[PDB]
Amino acid sequence: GSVVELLGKSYPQDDHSNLTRKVLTRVGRNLHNQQHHPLWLIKERVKEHFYKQYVGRFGTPLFSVYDNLSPVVTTWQNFDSLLIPADHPSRKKGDNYYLNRTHMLRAHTSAHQWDLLHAGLDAFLVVGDVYRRDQIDSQHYPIFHQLEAVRLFSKHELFAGIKDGESLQLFEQSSRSAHKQETHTMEAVKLVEFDLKQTLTRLMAHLFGDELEIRWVDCYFPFTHPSFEMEINFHGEWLEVLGCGVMEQQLVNSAGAQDRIGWAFGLGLERLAMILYDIPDIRLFWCEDERFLKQFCVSNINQKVKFQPLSKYPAVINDISFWLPSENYAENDFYDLVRTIGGDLVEKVDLIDKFVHPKTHKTSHCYRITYRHMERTLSQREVRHIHQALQEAAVQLLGVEGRF
RNA sequence: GCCGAGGUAGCUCAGUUGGUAGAGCAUGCGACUGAAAAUCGCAGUGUCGGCGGUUCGAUUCUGCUCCUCGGCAC
């Protein structure tokens, strides 16, 4: 192509330019907004915590969210503004999706970190979709989303609530130790790290509970100094969820906060929403079968769910109707006998009709049992025995008169 | 980035030693039922992944690509 139009804009090409048809379809999909989409939950699920938990100044929260931003970011943005050196590994063409040499599809939300600073925000969140060209397996995929967050602080406030003897210039000419920026102070550092570590420890528990195995491991980031990587154990093996550290000053000073300090952090909604929901193969996140997108109904974000596998095989539906016996009979009783008699491979049951006979005045119910194996395709003959093993069981043990 | 397996009716797949293709589950009408299910009778469906190539003729053979799945690995 001579050019490529993405969002009311067309971009030239070159040996950098490498966007595939496949990938491209996705862009603008903005999944972290399909409301009842796991990814979105984690957004308010996280948007909320911060709303309640923090509010600097009056009733205006300090963490102002941005959930709809242009993935198509310049280059200076995604790399340069974050002090990322030239020829740095992560600038490999076969890792990033470039439109042209100077414009690409943000590899990380950390790309906006600079603009927002410059602007005026001193505290914010950015939830979006990002791309990274790579494999496609259980835990990796062309496209995913990130929730990034950032907070700054005032020199007369970082400390403040301290034995008010202001002999604490939030930063000097020291030196970069594996523990602080050459232009930072231990007291200042140790604090925000606490806040950053703090805010995060707090935020996690809120989401997961307080029975989560979590630790910090030291790491590296071109745009943060003390860098830590929050990992979370579950299933027996420790998994990872985010990246964070204080903010690199140069980065800040360059922007519009020559006299401030702060921390940044961005997490992977797929990662979180995967443990928090027991969805194993990231890919599923792009499934459309009701059997999926719905498992995440709930009238409350903070509510919890536990992914039901979901077999991609022919289902074999049968119906069973019976007249109800007076006085004793509750729905959940019949839902268990089904799940008891030939259960384990039922997937779903629905009440498809409540008929109150006009003359006998006896009630009838019609349940729709959706048989469906997870490994093979089930035959009518294989099933029926099960269904039948419920017709002569539903009677005896439930006290119904079987319309069959 | 590399190595292997594949893209065929809604879903899962089989087949044609090359002459435009099926089985199970699902779907539609009839009977039965207040309405269903099961049951019995009848029926339908696919540009057989996209582009070229060998051949009288390809979904079946070759060459490329796109996509999917898996295994190794940056």
SS3 assignment for A374-385? CCCCCCHHHHHH
A240 is in an annotated binding site: yes
Q: Measured in angstroms, what separates residue A309's CA from nucleotide B20's C1'?
A: 39
Beta pairing class for A64-66 and A123-131? parallel
CA A123 to chain centre: 21
A288-319 b/e with 16+ CB inside 10 Å = b? eeebbeebbeeeeeeeeeebeebbeeebbebe
> Annotation-wise, does A335 bind a ligand?
no
Q: Tell me, in Å, how far CA of A381 is from C1' of B13?
A: 19
Handedness of CA A176, A178, A181, A184 (dihedral sign): negative
Q: Is A152 helix (H, G, I), strand (E, B) or coil?
A: strand
A229 is in an annotated binding site: no
Do residues A400 and A324 make contact, with C-beta atoms less than 8 angstroms apart? yes
Does residue A134 contact residue A92 with C-beta atoms inside 8 Å? no
* Dihedral sign of CA atoms A71, A131, A254, A180 in order: positive
- With beta carbons less than 8 A apart as the criterion, state whether A371 and A346 touch: yes
Nearest partner of A149 among A122, A171, A167, A131, judged by Cα: A122
CB A111 within 8 A of CB A120: no
Q: Any idea what the CATH number is for the domain that residue A131 is in?
A: 3.30.930.10
Residue A231 three-state SS: strand
Q: How far is the CA of A363 from the C1' of B54 (A)?
A: 72
**Tokens of residue A167, six digits:** 């002999």
Tokens found for residue A283 = 């890919």
Q: How far is the CA of A357 from the C1' of B68 (A)?
A: 53
State yes or no: A77 annotated in a binding site.
Answer: no
Residues contacting nucleic strand B by the 7 Å CB criterion are: A 20-22, 94, 134-138, 140, 281, 283, 312-321, 352-353, 355, 364, 366, 377-381, 384, 387, 403-404
Residues 6+ apart with CB under 8 A from A57: none
CB A346 within 8 A of CB A403: no
Statement to judge: residues A247 and A320 lie in one domain: no
Q: Which amino acid is at A214?
A: I
For A252, how many CA atoms within 13 A lie in the half-sphere containing its CB? 24
Beta bridge partners of A358: none
* One domain for residues A297 and A313: no
Burial (CB < 10 A; 0-12, 13-18, 19+), residue A360, is: exposed
**Cα separation, A176 vs A282, whole angstroms:** 39
| Cβ–Cβ under 8 Å, residues A7 and A72 | yes
User: In whole angstroms, what is the distance from residue A148 CA to residue A234 CA?
Assistant: 23
Method by which the coordinates were obtained: X-ray
Alpha-carbon gap, residue A228 to A243, rounded angstroms: 6
Helix axes A380-398, A331-340, angle to 10 degrees: 140
Residues A330 and A291 in one domain: no
Q: Are residues A364 and A275 in the same domain?
A: no
Answer yes or no: do A274 and A318 share one domain.
no
By C-alpha distance, which of A20, A19, A15, A24 is closest to A101? A15
Determine the 3-state secondary structure of A149 from DSSP.
strand
Which structural domain, as residue segments, surrounds residue A356? 309-404
Inter-CA distances, A329 with A338, A352, A391, A397, Å: 14, 17, 16, 11
Q: How many CB atoms lie within 10 A of CB A214?
A: 16
Nucleotides of B under 7 A from a protein CB: 1-2, 10-12, 24-27, 34-39, 66-74
Find the Å distance, CA of residue A153 to C1' of nucleotide B57: 78
Evaluate whether A31 touches A67 at the Cβ level (below 8 Å): no
Q: Which nucleotide is nearest to A320 (CA to C1')?
A: B37
Judge contact between A372 and A347, C-beta under 8 A.
yes
Edge to edge, the sheet with strand A143-153 lists: A64-66, A123-131, A143-153, A261-268, A242-246, A224-228, A218-221
A219 and A272 both lie in a single domain: yes
Q: Where are the alpha helices (DSSP H) in A209-346?
A: 249-254, 269-275, 290-293, 331-340
Q: Residue A351: which residues within 8 A CB-CB, separation 6 or more? A: A331, A365, A366, A367, A368
Show which of A308, A324, A348 is a domain's final residue: A308
Determine how many CB atoms are found less than 10 A away from the CB of residue A357: 10
First-to-last CA distance in chain A?
65
Residue A141 assigned as binding residue: yes
Q: How far apart are CA A310 and CA A292, in angstroms?
A: 8
Residue after which a domain boundary falls, among A308, A342, A368:
A308
Query: Are A293 and A339 in the same domain?
Result: no
Asked if A172 and A183 count as a contact pair (C-beta separation under 8 A), the reply is yes
Please count the structural domains in chain A.
2
Residue A194 contacts residue A224 (beta carbons within 8 Å): no
Q: Number of helices (H) and strands (E) in chain A: give both, helices first.
A: 10, 19
Q: For residue A373, report the phi and psi dihedrals to the nearest 5 degrees.
A: -70, 155
Residue A24 in tokens: 């491209």
A355: nt with nearest C1' to CA = B34
Q: Which nucleotide is nearest to A141 (CA to C1')?
A: B68
Do A230 and A242 meet the contact criterion of CB atoms below 8 Å apart?
A: yes
Decide which of A308, A323, A353 is a domain's last residue.
Answer: A308
A162 and A248 fall within a common domain: yes
The residue lying closest to nucleotide B39, measuring its CA against C1', is A404
Q: Looking at residue A395, which CATH number applies to its domain?
A: 3.30.70.380
Helices (H), A209-248: none
Task: Indicate whether A107 and A171 sit together in one domain.
Answer: yes
Question: Do A334 and A249 have their domain in common?
Answer: no
Q: How far is the CA of A106 from the C1' of B74 (A)?
A: 21
* Shared domain check, A298 and A252: yes
Token pair for residue A155? 């020199």
Q: Are residues A185 and A327 both part of a single domain? A: no
- Give the distance, in angstroms, between residue A379 CA and nucleotide B13 C1': 14
User: Distance between CA A348 and CA A369 in Å, rounded?
Assistant: 7
